């Protein structure tokens, strides 16, 4: 599975750019696909979403009406066309998969995005603690707090936990607040109730320090946390 | 052929058989003991049923 | 268990007359279209005679259309085949092959190599 | 052959007399002082549409929400029985299929048919597509049933008078079960997964032993072909349906017939059989386009499921007794309750 | 709407699957399926080849922009009463008979009768292919045949003078051909109820116009289906 | 005076109403989805509306006002043309079925029938609103300039429907006659002749006589008015006999 992105660079304000992402290694035509941002030193931020078959498109209210997203299945590539670039669009862009059916785990694979530099009723998620210095072997618990209740009527609690290691792209750990993503050690766990969730790590080891983010997928826009940099 | 059948009948003809009364009693006991967990026999209220 | 036995045959010279019986037990006799088949030495199974549930419909195989006659008795659970004026082409083993499903007119593979509801066979020789 | 046929008949008579000596009372009389269930009426909660040709098999998932259905146009479809969504639609290589099975874990699905091959498809894959992971071959006749044991063990029943215990990792039979003299039409796994029963076209059922490969017992009560078989929830009984227009209940411990469920009006042939969670309701499809529901302890019919306009092929109760889905030859599935 | 942000995507995926199913339905309707039967000596392999441990074989051929798939079983046992139920939505059943060999003619007649009177094949219409015509003609004109040995009723059969189309053939073979066809048609019309029709033919080994008789009989079958739909027949 | 004719009209309307209602019941949401069944369903609905209007008007004729008759008239003359259009469409579809047998079965749109059905419905109501406006209030053209053209258009459309049905039946009969033998074509002949004669002699007269004698100003006779009642009775008989023929000789 590969998701390599092209584009980025320095652009004067008022210009335009086109960013591409060439999927190679999976069935690109059956995955909904998102573009997600990240400021040079701030947290993650959702940008745009295009469904499977191009039948549903959503944009973030920050860039709504100014960005455009469009896929191409026979060529296996997905484009974001952006115009009138301000000074707050300077960021690193990642392209993310997601497939939706009963029992799937959206936000499986994150690409390694590109850097671009220039010259209301949303659900706010709060991650109070921002630094947890701890040695290996201890049991740690990170807390995330939601604005409103994330538990839908069908019983699913839409909370996602992502880990960004130093110098690497994020990767999914927990989806829907309880389930464990395929390919991660069993020591990670997630629990909690509406408006108050926690992620527990038992027997902390190396290759685990980084920044932990919580996301909600109850309704668009998708809002991230602020991050808790676990150090040694 | 004609030897496997006889050997199999010899192998099958010597087993211990319980009565039919014990079989009926055990079937009735299981059915009566688990008689309050199947929605098809005793319908559940509509607040629970997902269909 | 279904079982069919045809202990009715013997040894007669050409021009004589025989009669084959068939004792059936293990199933309701009145809903099945019983048959009568035969296998010759060196040849495969072939169909000989037919009879319906109550006896209204009968059928033969041409080579015996004028000689043999097939009847049944549902009260005694028996099937009979009266065979007379035997030719030297009739020395064979006869089977009381039944019919797979009840309440049907069609019924398949009555003369198969390994059929389930079929008797042991009776050998008749003419010389 | 001279005296072997006589000794076999003597042994059969001995077995029959031994079975007769252990039958002092009938289940009809012991279960006489039991309150009947009255009338069980069910209504179509959901109707699943989307198949082009007749439906030949179905299997409920282990979570009581997902199910798989196989059709004669060469398609498997994995539904969502709560919202009637189509989770998966898998096209097949051979369009003549008569069986399908869901893995207990939920990672794999299996389908077989008239090409004498059992195909194992991997559902939970990367790349987000269902691809065939194994093609078990080695049967010399059409494949009529298949049931998973683990994610690496599957029992198949074919029309060449054989059953087989396979090994999906290496892809070759580890055991062969022989002894039937006709096409084998159905099998039902034991709850503990150590035994299984199999009904064949020679009007007989056989209780096997998975690990050894022997034939533990043989039951012969029917008088025509056997189309469906199912285990009692206890695991010490099983019900069989035939072209006899009758259904029967057999005991593994008493080793003889217990009860026959029949009616003079019915003259068609049973096509499918399933039990309720408690074992108080026996469900049986039929050739006259509608199912039936029998009180398994008193042999009186107490419900009819008439919603199909063609022959009913498949039928299966879910694990917790929530619903009952019946497939049929007009390409429509119907989830009752 | 009372749906989450993900159940909507599930519904959209289901709708895409339904659109693909509609395309597959169109493709499945445009094609016609035939079932090919016959014994080992019938020469049905020659008919298979004339159209330019696996348990079934399928061949594809098209005529006048109409696509036909023909199926024949290859590795199943000889019981046939359980895998013949699968072929009850087919367009036609091609039946091949070897008419030169009278020793096995009664077996072929029994096969045809059993196929015709089937409970699930009660709407499918057979396309009889009386094969090996040159062999029958040679064996009849060369003598030493004596068809009356196996069929006693042939000693008092006269050709149907009204319908005697033949392009310069000996009158003795015509009686035999029409006797055999009369036997098969008598079996066909003994109990048909007017729902399916047998279409007899006369074929050789080197015959080339075998892919057009199938098309003509299939067109007639479809026309009869339409007539029955509109309550005209 | 003639009142027995009105009583027979009421009786025929009752039997046609119950026949259409039961046909709608058996063909509501199942038992077939052919093009023929969809056409029969739409025809039965139109005939049910027409017979309801006819029954209410006939009951009003005995004792009961003009306003309710004004309400009744347009829906009646809307359902009438809906039913005639459905009959012509059924005849054209059967002729096309026999003419090209493979196209009707293999290469035919599944929903096309339903599509054209609703189109026919729309056309009928269009004429209805035209009949209300271009003659009634918007132009006050009771006789001057516009209602003449509207009635000429109505008569031309009725003649077109008649000729379409007759031509389709004749083409089907010719194709079957010139075709092959070995079929019992007696049922085909009797069915085609029965449907054609019933349609002609029980559907055409009412509309033709109304929209001709209404404009023709030589109406001075008591023998020129009993044709009105006889045509009403014939149209009621047509609407009652539409479902019985098709559905009951189909699913007998
Ligand atoms: C003002 O007549 C209209 C006109 C249009 C729509 C409705 C009415 S009406 O309902 O009000 N009168 C009425 C009622 C019922 C009948 C049996 C006749 C009626 O008179 C008509 C109807 C139709 C006419 C026609 N097509 N051409 C010419 C003269 C016409 C006169």
Numbering used by the authors:
A (entry chain C): 2 to 120, 136 to 248
B (entry chain D): 11 to 61
C (entry chain E): 1 to 127
D (entry chain B): 25 to 361
E (entry chain A): 4 to 55, 182 to 362
F (entry chain F): 26 to 89, 91 to 278
Paper passage:
Mas-related G-protein-coupled receptors X1-X4 (MRGPRX1-X4) are 4 primate-specific receptors that are recently reported to be responsible for many biological processes, including itch sensation, pain transmission, and inflammatory reactions. MRGPRX1 is the first identified human MRGPR, and its expression is restricted to primary sensory neurons. Compared with other MRGPRX members, MRGPRX1 stands out for its dual roles in mediating itch and inhibiting persistent pain. Due to its dual roles in itch and pain signaling pathways, MRGPRX1 has been regarded as a promising target for itch remission and pain inhibition.
Here, we reported a cryo-electron microscopy (cryo-EM) structure of Gq-coupled MRGPRX1 in complex with a synthetic agonist compound 16 in an active conformation at an overall resolution of 3.0 Å via a NanoBiT tethering strategy. Compound 16 is a new synthetic MRGPRX1 agonist with high potency and selectivity over other MRGPRXs and opioid receptor. NanoBit tethering strategy was used for the complex formation, with the LgBit and HiBit fused to the C-terminus of the receptor and Gβ subunit, respectively. The MRGPRX1 exhibits a shallow, broad, and wide-open ligand-binding pocket. The distance between compound 16 and the critical toggle switch residue G2296.48 is about 16.8 Å, indicating that compound 16 is positioned near the extracellular surface but not buried deep in the receptor. Compound 16 adopts a hairpin conformation in the pocket due to the intramolecular π-π interaction of the 1-aminoisoquinoline and phenylmethyl groups. Notably, the amino group of 1-aminoisoquinoline forms strong salt bridges with E1574.60 and D1775.36, 2 conserved residues in all MRGPRXs. Additionally, the variable residue Y993.29 recognizes compound 16 through 2 types of interactions, the π-π interaction with the middle aromatic ring of compound 16 and polar interaction with the amino group of 1-aminoisoquinoline. Hence, the initiation of MRGPRX1 activation is likely triggered by touching F2376.56 at the bottom of the pocket upon agonist binding, pushing a series of residues in TM6 to move towards TM3 and resulting in the conformational change of G2296.48. However, extensive interactions of ICL2 with the αN-helix and α5-helix of Gαq are observed in the MRGPRX1 structure.
